[PDB]
A = this chain, B = another copy of it.
Amino acid sequence: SCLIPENLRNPKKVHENRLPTRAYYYDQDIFESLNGPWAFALFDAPLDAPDAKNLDWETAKKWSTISVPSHWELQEDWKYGKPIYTNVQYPIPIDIPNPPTVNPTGVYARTFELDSKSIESFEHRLRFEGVDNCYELYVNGQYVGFNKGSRNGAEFDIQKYVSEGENLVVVKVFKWSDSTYIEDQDQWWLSGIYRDVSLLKLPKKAHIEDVRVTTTFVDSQYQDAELSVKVDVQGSSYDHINFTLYEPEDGSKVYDASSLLNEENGNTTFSTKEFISFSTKKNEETAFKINVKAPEHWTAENPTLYKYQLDLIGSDGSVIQSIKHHVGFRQVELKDGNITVNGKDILFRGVNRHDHHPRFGRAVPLDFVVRDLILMKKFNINAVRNSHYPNHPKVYDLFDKLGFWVIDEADLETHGVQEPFNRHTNLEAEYPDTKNKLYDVNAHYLSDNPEYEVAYLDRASQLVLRDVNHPSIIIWSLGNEACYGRNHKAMYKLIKQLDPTRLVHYEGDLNALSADIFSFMYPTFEIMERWRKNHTDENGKFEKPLILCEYGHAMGNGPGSLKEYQELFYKEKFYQGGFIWEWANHGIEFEDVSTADGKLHKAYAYGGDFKEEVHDGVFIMDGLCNSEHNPTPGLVEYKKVIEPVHIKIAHGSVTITNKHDFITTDHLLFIDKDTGKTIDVPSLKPEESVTIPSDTTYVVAVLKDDAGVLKAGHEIAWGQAELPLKVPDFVTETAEKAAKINDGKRYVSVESSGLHFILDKLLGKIESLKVKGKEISSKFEGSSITFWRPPTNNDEPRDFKNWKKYNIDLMKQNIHGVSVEKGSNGSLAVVTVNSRISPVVFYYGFETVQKYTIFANKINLNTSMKLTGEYQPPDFPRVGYEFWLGDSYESFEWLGRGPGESYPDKKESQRFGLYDSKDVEEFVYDYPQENGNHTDTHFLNIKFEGAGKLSIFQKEKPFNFKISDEYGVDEAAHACDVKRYGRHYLRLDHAIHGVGSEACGPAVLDQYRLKAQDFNFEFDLAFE
């Protein structure tokens, strides 16, 4: 293929002239930023781009500019195209290893100044932190080299090419290559120089090239440790190295964005609290091993660090170069079948975090990454998986300092090889225990393809060698969803040679033939349990443990049943936790035309909005946080189920159990919320518990002092005693009032002092109910009892298909008889309505009796619903009344769960209490769907201006409710597409279907499903 350049279709051309990967250290004196405006032009394909060996700055000066770093699909007015979203499918034809012939090619150009002294004093390099997909590099019209690996770095020696005065850098960037085949992550396709570019000036005669730091405990009791520091010095003109380790700074250290990101400085004295000092001797190995007496451990719960300074020293005893970094005393092992850190079998409370920003894409400001991690810490997360590639190199000090268990992952995904296979065989489902046989079929294309070995090894080598020295990283991962083949085995051998100190993960390798860990994604409990049992021998020993590298798919309303996963995690030593997918929605900000308004509004794009030929729609929106990286109810729920302290209140006792891996409860203040006075809780070690006699209902565990990025008073855990359903002390007026009953041909009236009740007998509709200045009426379309909800993302693949199939949205009430009698026991009147509630097309439905017992200040509504007929649905979304609220309506207040929404399998984070609608910002989903329900509601007060409250309570069971404004939710593509009525309604529900995680994972669990059955429930409408 001579119409496609050789290097874009050669899997072995991983780079040309790239320097060997070394440990990353930012140094202000060495690093000089080349970020900013660059000359830029885009071409249809390589053959339209100029020859860079002949490109003048005088010519490039005339082009438009683009700012580095940024993606070229994310510019003002979509100047250079729009983002493309695909999940599994490749957006190109599969013709390995050829990219498409029409291959967007972007040429970047800028200049920089070089001194006379500069070229003499320094070795000059260019370092590119990330360029997608690949590029060739030119300096002063001379070819320097080539590079592949979008999320990896690259350094090139530039010394031969530089001149005094102006220097011209030209980068030719290509969108597609043979590399595209191994970069098929479920994310946006975005191109360009999206990470920092730097000019490096290293001391010329000698400099530090690489450093290796390891900490190995000498002993099984993890006290004394050996600190090993090996240095690679390049050049002859040096004497020796010095090394100073400083006194530790406890992991409880207070940070903020400013101090975490501070990059200074040359004259800045790193530290002076010396602990250990070592010097090398002239002509001796520039490495050493030191015994360290009982050092403070580095742990994710307590990220204690020892700062160090490494000095390269010349003959005259002057400092040639310094490295200022840190040591975290930590050892990871596979021990008795568990992932072990300092001897302890840890629990992952994790997420997958992609690089994403709603405006900049994968070009994420560090400021924003810090924001992410502070939020994670604020919500009890202790681990992150770098799905599915290494991040910006500066991010790893953030993990080190804040404390996260980190899975650093190779930039390698091959998923798309399956798509044609899936479609050709009409595959419906993949299961963690069996799906590997399906991937085995196509592994020969890439992961079992010898032509790709060099590329695969490069992804491994680049991954490990850049980030080796970060204590936060405990696991290397070979990539994601790339099938299984010989190349993976090769990667495993190499990584163990390069870095024996860590463990290797790869989920595509079911049996872990070349991994140290087992890993499932989105497994069913039964599937987890099968695996556990088949890998635990008769003695109870297992060789390797199980983690869930992805689980509890956080797409939209959900995920349900995080609780049940957690119970499983705590019960078996074999399970060591999981990482939920995903941290945040990948929404891109854009201008949307409103379906509600006809006008232009800000929205967040998912597949289809940028009009891709092929895309995967709303699967972009699968985070615990929204596109703006703010918490959803998903994150709120996750924080609760993973809380590292259990507080159980029953039988006049509070039981507190420490569920941390390492730290004590000493940092926590326990408050009795009923009294406000604190509770003396003994210092609890991991897994230790205590029972304290108490009359309390509600206990909170809170931070005593600012520590890390958390503030004093920040809630870590809490518990409540279960709250019995109490009938409010409402006094029903049973005194005898004269009442006019008018039973007309169609309408029935009941009028009394302060009361007006009108029912349409033909429809079963309440035309108007006005009691003491407060009015409601039925929100009626076909039926007075309704069943539909705007489908969640989880509802879509199955439950919605069923509910639509059975016409649940078209349920009709057909009145058979209406009975009107005078009041009995204090009653004004009794109106009884007999009907069948059934959808068009169908036999199935409910023989329904609605008995309205009318009192002067209260209306008792008894509902009896008998499920009858053949060919029934399995379940319903919902069941209850819809009422229009009067013009007077202003706000509401409830006793039950809050402050936020709650659903059967997503409710426990929402503690019991008295809540006011005025105190709550109701959550707006990036993709409109079922929202705003409140489950386990004891009572609900609806406030009407100038007329007090209407109290609503269900007899003998808590109920569900939603008060809103909104409709057209099913078909609104974005928040701004949601329509709004001129009045509010109450959705008053006996029961509601759970939420689950079926968009990717298990269906709503049995105990949370709203199964088809008879319904019988009684409500009181009490008017103040």
Contact = CB atoms under 8 A, between A and B. Distances in A.
B871 A420 contact: yes
Nearest to A420: B871
A3 B841 contact: no
Nearest to A100: B814
Nearest to A762: B45
Given A95-B838, A416-B841, A613-B840, A762 B423 contact: no
Nearest to A873: B424
A871 to B, nearest CB: 4
Given A45-B762, A762-B3, A814 B101 contact: yes
Interface in A856-875: 869-872
Given A95-B836, A762-B44, A871 B424 contact: yes
Contacts of A90: 840-841
B814 A98 contact: yes
Interface stretch (A550-558, A631-639, A727-735, A803-811): A803-811
Contacts of A420: 841-844, 870-871
Interface stretch (A66-74, A588-596, A784-792, A815-823): A815-823
A800 to B, nearest CB: 15
Contacts of A614: 807, 810, 840-841
A812 interface: yes
A254 interface: no
Contacts of A114: none
Nearest to A93: B838
Nearest to A89: B841
Contact of A1 (B761, B763, B816, B871): B816
B93 A814 contact: yes
B100 A812 contact: yes
Nearest to A96: B843
Contacts of A113: none
- Oligomer copy total: 2
Size class of the A contact interface (CB-based, 8 Å): 35 or more
Contact of A101 (B815, B840, B844, B869): B815
Contacts of A841: 89-91, 93-94, 416, 419-420, 614
Contacts of A818: 3
B745 A95 contact: no
A288 interface: no
Nearest to A805: B423
A95 B871 contact: no
Contacts of A416: 841
B3 A761 contact: yes
Q: Which of A48, A100, A805 counts the most chain B CB atoms within 10 A?
A: A100
A839 B93 contact: yes
Interface string A507-546: 0000000000000000000000000000000000000000
Given A816-B1, A841-B90, A810 B613 contact: yes
Interface string A585-622: 00000000000000000000000000001100000000
A692 interface: no
Nearest to A45: B762
Interface string A79-118: 0000000000111111100101110000000000000000
A2 interface: yes
Contacts of A677: none
A102 B762 contact: yes
Contacts of A836: 93, 95, 98
Given A95-B845, A100-B812, A421-B871, 9 more contacts: A1-B816, A44-B762, A45-B762, A91-B840, A93-B839, A102-B763, A423-B805, A613-B810, A614-B807
23 contacts: A2-B817, A3-B762, A3-B816, A3-B818, A48-B762, A91-B840, A92-B840, A93-B838, A93-B839, A94-B841, A95-B836, A95-B845, A98-B814, A98-B836, A101-B816, A102-B814, A416-B841, A419-B841, A419-B842, A420-B844, A421-B871, A423-B871, A614-B840
Closest 4 CB pairs of A and B: A420-B871, A424-B871, A93-B838, A1-B816
